């Protein structure tokens, strides 16, 4: 999920990554 892991970019490696990209989604 794109936004999903726009969070991720957004929080860094903080937020655990946003739980691993949700448990490896796109």
Same mark, same amino acid.
């Given at each position: 999920?794109? @936004?999903?892991? +726009? =969070?991720? =970019? @957004?929080?860094?490696? +903080? ?12």
């Amino acid at each position: 999920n794109p @936004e999903l892991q +726009r =969070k991720c =970019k @957004e929080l860094x490696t +903080r937020x655990x990554x946003x739980x691993x990209x949700x448990x490896x989604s796109d």
